[PDB]
Amino acid sequence: GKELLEKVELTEDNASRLEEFSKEWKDASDKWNAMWAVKIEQTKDGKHYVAGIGLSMEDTEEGKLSQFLVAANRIAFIDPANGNETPMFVAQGNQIFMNDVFLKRLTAPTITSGGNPPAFSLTPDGKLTAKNADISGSVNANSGTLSNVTIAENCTINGTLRAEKIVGDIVKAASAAFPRQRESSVDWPSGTRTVTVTDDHPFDRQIVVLPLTFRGSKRTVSGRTTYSMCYLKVLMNGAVIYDGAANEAVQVFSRIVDMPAGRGNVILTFTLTSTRHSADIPPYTFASDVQVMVIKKQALGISVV
Amino acid sequence: GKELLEKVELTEDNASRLEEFSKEWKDASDKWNAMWAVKIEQTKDGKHYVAGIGLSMEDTEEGKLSQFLVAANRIAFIDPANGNETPMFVAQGNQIFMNDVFLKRLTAPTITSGGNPPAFSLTPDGKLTAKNADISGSVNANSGTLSNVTIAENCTINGTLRAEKIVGDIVKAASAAFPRQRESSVDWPSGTRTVTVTDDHPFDRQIVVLPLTFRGSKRTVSGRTTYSMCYLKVLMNGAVIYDGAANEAVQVFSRIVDMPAGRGNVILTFTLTSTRHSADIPPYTFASDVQVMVIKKQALGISVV
Amino acid sequence: GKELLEKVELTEDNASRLEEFSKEWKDASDKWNAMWAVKIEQTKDGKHYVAGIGLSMEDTEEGKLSQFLVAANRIAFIDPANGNETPMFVAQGNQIFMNDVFLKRLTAPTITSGGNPPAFSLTPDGKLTAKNADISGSVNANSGTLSNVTIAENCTINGTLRAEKIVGDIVKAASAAFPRQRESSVDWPSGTRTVTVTDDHPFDRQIVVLPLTFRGSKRTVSGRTTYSMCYLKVLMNGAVIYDGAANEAVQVFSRIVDMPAGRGNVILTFTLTSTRHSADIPPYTFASDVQVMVIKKQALGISVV
Amino acid sequence: HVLLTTSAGNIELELDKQKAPVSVQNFVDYVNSGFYNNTTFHRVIPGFMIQGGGFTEQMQQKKPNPPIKNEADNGLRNTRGTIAMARTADKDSATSQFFINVADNAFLDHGQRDFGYAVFGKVVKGMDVADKISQVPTHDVGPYQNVPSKPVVILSAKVL
Amino acid sequence: HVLLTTSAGNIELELDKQKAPVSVQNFVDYVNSGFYNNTTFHRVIPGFMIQGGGFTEQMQQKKPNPPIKNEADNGLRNTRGTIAMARTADKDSATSQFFINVADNAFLDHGQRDFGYAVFGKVVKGMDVADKISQVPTHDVGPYQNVPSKPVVILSAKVL
Amino acid sequence: HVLLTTSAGNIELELDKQKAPVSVQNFVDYVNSGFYNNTTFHRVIPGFMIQGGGFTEQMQQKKPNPPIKNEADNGLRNTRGTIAMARTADKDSATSQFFINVADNAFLDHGQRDFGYAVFGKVVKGMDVADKISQVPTHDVGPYQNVPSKPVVILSAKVL
């Protein structure tokens, strides 16, 4: 019959197609069941997040999913408009850091430095501790201590200082009485007093010699007048600046000797010589102590003459 | 025939294989169509980035893709050489932070602290505002104000201070004239002047008594000479440091009394007594005012004798 | 009979089902082979990380994998408990930053600022450089310099200052001798010395006039006594504060004139007049120089009377 | 003119009404309807500023009006003695809290997408009161830092 | 009472034994059994603190006992002159290294999750020795910075 | 020796030639061929440094030569009065801009991966000119900050 030569060969070509489909299915299924994927799970809202990595043709229980590990050097971020590729991590000698082209904005972070008591600390409420800083510009200290700081001329130093803790002298004083030569029971002044000022100051000074009164005496016996003389002679570095003779009326020596800075020591020599009334009567002379003051020598608003 | 039993039973095993393939296809297709994946899209360069999450067997339009959400606690980064796993986020009491083992390098960030006017602020161009800091080391200020700072000894204080704003006195002066006792139309000095210096200074001081001149008088009537005596007695804390008798020729008292710190008040008593010429004639005596000056007492480069 | 009409149609229906399965296979295989996925690779420990993006039905060699790119604006992190979505990046004018709701904790980072020598720098070991800062609170400097800082009153200023670098004078001094008028071979003092203190100080001052001794003389010839008189007249701002006549016994002028701040210049006029013994004999008078010292005028612990 | 009568003294404040009209309207509406009566300066940092106007004596927050727009681009700067409106992270979130600048705060100045802080007032008298307040001891580490240990109470706010 | 007889001088330390019992027990067991002899102050930052007790004269780390629990919640603060136990990143990792506060370090005080640093001692005599030590020149940039150029050696440690 | 004749005065610079030969060759080639004539110190921060050599009076950038390699490992440090080459982010990108250190900048010193800044010169005379320049008022917030309001101009750059 005709029916035995067309539809009976269908059982063989159908078998050949079934064998080809079996081979394709074996090739594809054995690679589907070996395939690992990123597994998508759900919240109770329909949100579909990445929950980890697992076999594609399985279910798991959202547990025993082997975590979403990414290889760090393989992840980068793109703008899908220009195609600019930005790696997430940068390698620095077996340490991986974030790319830091992000990382442009921190709000209320806590930052601490290395050592373990830390030198640097930034608290999220904004307390800053530096402890190993180098600052410049606009400091308003409420407490603390300066140690080796050069305070400038234009720094206002409102506040007090002690009278001590001033290097210079501003004023000094010194004093001495003339040697007294005596005979019997009467003494008279006679000798030399030397006043030496050491040149150990950066500024000009004046040696104010407070008034020095000296006098002699007069005796009238049997109508004969005997004068007891007094001679005061002052030497400044050997130069005679004064020479006085007093008979019975007083003479007074006072002076302001100038002491410039760097010119060396100033030596003032006060020498008193007394003369006897006669060959027998001891002298009756008087001379007040040597009193001297060295001042800071300001020549400004105090005019004389 | 032989073909009736060898090529007609093939339609049955073929049908069984087709039914088995139908069952496998129904099992696998319902798994493929229900499967969600991470969807890969393309830029107009062939770049193939992750664009979001969607059904595996669908197309979308790069829109309505349900975002690439990752579950935060599930993401970690590996080195695929040693297998070391580093989580991306660390939990701190319902707050998720970055793992901060990255985050080792920040260049030109903006940092601001918590409160809202902030205490700390770091501008991306390098301006720093701390305002609640505790700094140590190398401060180099161009403006500002110290409030309770202890400036140390080794801090150079280049700059000026006022004459006031010095706690100690350095120099003080005081003066008085002796009480005058008068009868008829003539007066003579007689009385006591007391100079007291309070011990209210940390340093040694000198009480410089500027020269005090006093004298009496002589009158000769009918060849009788009457002496008007003048006596000055100076007591330092009750101790007699001076005793003078002046007839007609002047005597001068001057002294530098030492005033050490902590030894108590120094009291200088100037007692001046005048004696009449006779039982009738009032005394004619003179005595200059008491003038005293208290100095800071430097004993350094002012040598005497 | 039945076998040539019942199981013969099995070949045709099997061929129809095979054609339907061929159509489904051609629809699904073309979809599978065109599908890009995220490729999962393995360490030699069984760890299964994300190694990049590649064709789903391929193998590659872990190389030529086209990198794991994510589209930046599409990545966000979820909590799969409440469903809160937190984007990874925030856009800021064509710049992408991390979300900074993470980024709450930095441990030993390196931070530097913009410019290229940077103003700000934080070394990972805790050295801080600010160099363009604005600090308040608790500064403990070990070195550096203040430039325009207002040091407050309650700042302890332990350390010394120079005697100079003090604006006020504290003490000044000035002196001059009286003009001498001479005839024949003898001179006597007579004239005016004017002492002017400029009112250029913020504090009260004292003008201490150190003792000024003047006297005349007496000569007796043929029982006639001639008195050479000496007169000193001191004017304070034109007002007479002293007037003295000396015959042969000395008089001494000394005074402490108060100089208040803001009252104006103080002018002290010392006028000496000498009267001759007779119509022929020149006067024999003496007067010591005018020495004056202006002090800072402390009225505290020094009392007289 | 507005006077804040505090336990420390009296603070006369001149309102810059021409440069910040809405801020000064809001501030005068609060001070007029006794809002700042019995309210503390809850945030005192010496060298920075003293912040008040939102918390009662027991550190409990008051009910403010709905906030005002930021007017920080009026060109007034955060100089010593000026008052700026305190706000939260939001730019136009300023309601009732202000602060007085006790020093020069240049980093709080701007008008831009970084809005900074709107200065609307100035202390003309009682800067010594602010100086005494700025130095009180503050220790409440935890919920709110830099809270004065003994509260600085605004007894009354008197508007002229 | 413990002596740290250093090359700079003598430091007298009164142990706060009633507030940090096990910490001061650990410190006294180290000082008693000759551990801190010939050990340097390896980390000196002027204005911060001076840290010693871990490294020998040639920068060689010594063998400590197993660490001690942090006792920083005793309410003793990191004030000038106090000794705190130095530790690593771990909160209960303090073994043998200590430091003296040469200034007021408020940021090192805490008893919380952030455990801070446990103060257990106080310099009662020889603060001048610590002041001379704090200002020595330190330059070992690289492995360990702030290492004094000429080592500050603890010659011996004597107990009382 | 190089004369930097500015509007403020004259700055005298001894070139450390033996330690930075290529930097000093590049600097002297710019100085000889009148590059720095009519160029401003565009970036002055008091307490830090003053930076010049790239911009004219109108704040426009000039054309430099190909850059020079960093020679910061010569061991010269960023002490007060030394000139270092200014550069961009790239470590070998220094072309023409320099800066004078007005203070001690220890954090700009290194020879390492972190190349720091190469000191090649020193102010020997005219420091006072640098202190006058360092304190001029600067306000150009935006593109370039710390720009002097009234620009300081290198009138001529004469070399010996």
Instruction: Give ∠ CA B256-B261-B262 in degrees, rounded to 5.
Output: 130
Experimental technique used? cryo-EM
- F156 DSSP β-pair partners: F5
| Residue F75: Cβ within 10 Å count | 9
Residues spanned by the domain of D27? 2-159
For residue F157, which of F121, F132, F128, F103 has the smallest C-alpha distance? F121
CB atoms C125 and E47 under 8 Å: no
**DSSP notation for D25-83:** HHHHHHHHTTSSTTEE--EEETTTEEEESSEETTS-B--PPS-B---GGGS----TTEE
Read off the amino acid at residue F70.
N
B37 in contact with chain C, both atoms CB, cutoff 8 A:
yes
| Residue C156: Cβ within 10 Å count | 12
For residue C227, which of C235, C237, C217 has the smallest C-alpha distance? C217
- Residue F26 in contact with residue F65, Cβ under 8 Å? yes
Chain E, window 125-154: residues with a beta carbon less than 8 angstroms from a chain B beta carbon: none
For the record, the structure tokens of B28 come out as 């696998």
Mention every residue, 6+ apart, whose C-beta is less than 8 A from residue D9. D126, D128, D129, D132
Which among E47, E104, E145 has CB closest to C142?
A: E47
Mention every residue, 6+ apart, whose C-beta is less than 8 A from residue E113. none
CB atoms B119 and D43 under 8 Å: no
The whole-angstrom distance between C157's CA and the closest CA on chain E is 19
**Residue in A closest to E146 by C-alpha:** A132
Q: How far is CA C259 from CA A43, A55, C208, C299, in A?
A: 94, 105, 10, 13
Measured distance CA(C232)–CA(C274) in Å, rounded: 9
CB atoms B119 and D51 under 8 Å: no
For the record, the structure tokens of C94 come out as 């064509």
Residues of chain A with C-beta less than 8 angstroms from the C-beta of F49: none
The CATH number assigned to the domain holding D11 equals 2.40.100.10
For the record, the structure tokens of A97 come out as 């850091």
- Residue F88 in contact with residue F105, Cβ under 8 Å? no
Specify the DSSP class assigned to residue C283: P
**DSSP notation for E36-97:** STTEE--EEETTTEEEESSEETTS-B----S-B---GGGS----TTEEEE---SSTT-B-S-
Measured distance CA(C23)–CA(C21) in Å, rounded: 5
- Residue D51 in contact with residue D83, Cβ under 8 Å? no
Domain count, chain D: 1
| Residue E72: Cβ within 10 Å count | 27
For residue C142, which of A131, D30, B1, A63 has the smallest C-alpha distance? A131
For residue A40, which of A71, A57, A62, A69 has the smallest C-alpha distance? A62
Specify the DSSP class assigned to residue F73: G
For the record, the structure tokens of E115 come out as 């455990």
For residue A123, which of B118, C301, C82 has the smallest C-alpha distance? B118
Mention every residue, 6+ apart, whose C-beta is less than 8 A from residue A95. B104
Q: Are strands B302-304 and A191-197 parallel, antiparallel or unpaired?
A: antiparallel
E109 in contact with chain B, both atoms CB, cutoff 8 A:
no
Q: How far is CA C150 from CA B153, C61, C153, E69, F46, in A?
A: 19, 72, 10, 48, 18
- Residue A131 in contact with residue C127, Cβ under 8 Å? no
The whole-angstrom distance between B92's CA and the closest CA on chain E is 11
For residue C178, which of A254, A180, D118 has the smallest C-alpha distance? A254
Which among D45, D107, D108 has CB closest to B132?
A: D45
Q: How far is CA E76 from CA C270, E20, E39, E120, in A?
A: 75, 9, 27, 8
**Residue in C closest to E47 by C-alpha:** C140
- Residue B192 in contact with residue B265, Cβ under 8 Å? no
CB atoms F117 and C117 under 8 Å: yes
CB atoms F145 and B140 under 8 Å: no
Mutate to test the interface with D, among C132, C134, C136 (most CBs of D within 10 A): C136
CB atoms A138 and D145 under 8 Å: no
Chains that touch B (3 or more CB pairs under 8 A): A, C, D, E, F
- Residue C294 in contact with residue C206, Cβ under 8 Å? yes
Measured distance CA(A157)–CA(A199) in Å, rounded: 31
Q: What Rg, from alpha-carbon coordinates, does chain E have?
A: 14
Residue with the two structure tokens 């594809």? A28
For the record, the structure tokens of D51 come out as 């912040």
Write down the number of H helices and E strands in chain D. 2, 10
For the record, the structure tokens of E129 come out as 């020795």
Measured distance CA(D70)–CA(D57) in Å, rounded: 28
Measured distance CA(F20)–CA(F23) in Å, rounded: 6
- E148 DSSP β-pair partners: E138
Measured distance CA(E13)–CA(E123) in Å, rounded: 4
Read off the amino acid at residue B291.
Q
Phi, psi angle pair for F42, to nearest 5°: -75, -10
Helices (H), F50-145: 127-134
For residue F11, which of F19, F1, F21 has the smallest C-alpha distance? F1
CB atoms D103 and C137 under 8 Å: no
C132 in contact with chain F, both atoms CB, cutoff 8 A:
yes
Residues of chain A with C-beta less than 8 angstroms from the C-beta of D135: 142
Residues of chain D with C-beta less than 8 angstroms from the C-beta of B135: none
For residue F113, which of B35, E14, E142 has the smallest C-alpha distance? E142
**DSSP notation for chain B:** -HHHHHSSTHHHHHHHHHHHHHHHHHHHHHHHHT-EEEEEE--TTS--EEEEEEETT----SSS---EEE-SSSEEEE-TTT--EEESEEESSS-EEE-SSS--EEES-EEE-SSSS-S-EE-TTS-EE-SSEEEES-EE-SSEEESS-EE-TTS---S-B-SSSBSS-SEEEEEE---EEEETTEEEE-EEEEEEE----SS-EEEEEEEEEEE-EEEEETTEEEEE-EEEEEEETTEEEEEEEESSS-EEEEEEEEE-TTS--EEEEEEEEE--SSSSSPP--EEPPEEEEEE----SSEEE-
| Residue B13: Cβ within 10 Å count | 12
Mutate to test the interface with B, among A30, A32, A48, A289 (most CBs of B within 10 A): A48
CB atoms B124 and C139 under 8 Å: no
Mention every residue, 6+ apart, whose C-beta is less than 8 A from residue E74. E16, E19, E20, E111, E118, E119
CB atoms A127 and D145 under 8 Å: yes
Residues of chain E with C-beta less than 8 angstroms from the C-beta of B134: 104, 106-107
Measured distance CA(F159)–CA(F1) in Å, rounded: 6
B148 in contact with chain D, both atoms CB, cutoff 8 A:
no
Mention every residue, 6+ apart, whose C-beta is less than 8 A from residue A221. none
CB atoms F48 and A136 under 8 Å: yes
**Residue in C closest to A206 by C-alpha:** C173
Residues of chain B with C-beta less than 8 angstroms from the C-beta of C131: 126
CB atoms D84 and B117 under 8 Å: yes
Q: How far is CA C77 from CA A51, A52, A74, in A?
A: 11, 13, 19
**Residue in D closest to C93 by C-alpha:** D113
Q: Number of B to F CB contacts under 8 A, please give it.
A: 9
Residues of chain D with C-beta less than 8 angstroms from the C-beta of B146: none
- Residue C68 in contact with residue C75, Cβ under 8 Å? no
B149 in contact with chain E, both atoms CB, cutoff 8 A:
no
Q: What Rg, from alpha-carbon coordinates, does chain A have?
A: 56
Measured distance CA(F118)–CA(F109) in Å, rounded: 8
- Furthest-apart CA pair in chain C: how many Å? 205
Q: Number of B to D CB contacts under 8 A, please give it.
A: 33
For the record, the structure tokens of A105 come out as 């904005």
Residue with the two structure tokens 């210049």? C265
CB atoms A149 and B151 under 8 Å: yes
- Residue A182 in contact with residue B190, Cβ under 8 Å? no
E90 in contact with chain C, both atoms CB, cutoff 8 A:
no
Which among E46, E104, E145 has CB closest to C142?
A: E46
For residue E84, which of E57, E55, E59, E111 has the smallest C-alpha distance? E111
Could you give all domains of chain A from N- to C-terminal order, each with its CATH number?
A: 171-295 (2.60.120)
**Residue in A closest to B166 by C-alpha:** A161
